[PDB]
Amino acid sequence: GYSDRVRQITLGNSTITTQEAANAVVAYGEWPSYLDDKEANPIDAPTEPDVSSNRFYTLDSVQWKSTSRGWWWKLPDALKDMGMFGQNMYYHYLGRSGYTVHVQCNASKFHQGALGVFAIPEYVMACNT
Amino acid sequence: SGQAVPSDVIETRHVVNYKTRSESTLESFFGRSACVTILEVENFNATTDAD
Ligand SMILES: [Ca+2]
Ligand SMILES: [Ca+2]
Ligand code: NA
Incomplete structure (x- = not known):
């Protein structure tokens, strides 16, 4: 009965x-x-x-189109305005956190495409000058 | 001097301190060769008292 395809995750008052x-x-x-x-x-x-x-x-959803080149977020930045997490983050000088990241994208048996989903420590990016 | 430490005036967690005061022992503080003077000498055919 149990399957690699079917999962439930519960944290606090929230379930996926x-x-x-x-x-x-x-x-x-x-x-x-x-x-x-x-x-x-x-x-x-x-x-x-x-x-x-x-x-x-x-988070706010984004739209995948045939022309999309991809998306990035940083953490804990992406959650800085999220409920009590954001409040605890900003009331303190120091914080640490792990995460469960759940990326969601359904389509149909007639669509095709593949997204790489990567978690990158110290994701330093180039500047534009 | 004042003697109080943080546990006396706040709520504290347990933190194990593995750090040592090795580099502030007197031997460590003074354990360096320091320049104390610069002397000058010369070698040439001296024909005056000053030279
Ligand atoms: Ca608590
Ligand atoms: Ca105390
Ligand atoms: Na100690």
Whole structure:
């Protein structure tokens, strides 16, 4: 019954379903986690907002056309204005976060096309002068 | 002097400190060859007291 194509993800008050997935990637084989005492740095008791902020936020959609060359976002930038995550981000000097990224694009059995979806650490880009 | 530390006046997490004061021991602080003077000498056929 269970399938590599069918998945549910629940975080906080939010749930995603998909019926045509292709497994899932865990970047570098490592699930996110909290910061251990033996690797800690700032000494103030941290805020851990948990369900208020650790939940799915859906960005404005973009349109894929035959002429599209692609899209980029940065993180945590893309979520800076998202509910309580954004508030916790901006009220503090320091923050860390992992992510579940879910990119959605359905069509039909008669459409064709392929999107590469990449998560890039330190995605530094060239300037235009 | 004042003695209070952060745990006395705020809520703190546990942070293990592995860092050491190795480079501020007196031996470390003074462990450098420092220039203390510049002397001058010459070699030539001297015919005056000054030379
Ligand atoms: Ca909390
Ligand atoms: Ca305290
Ligand atoms: Na220590």
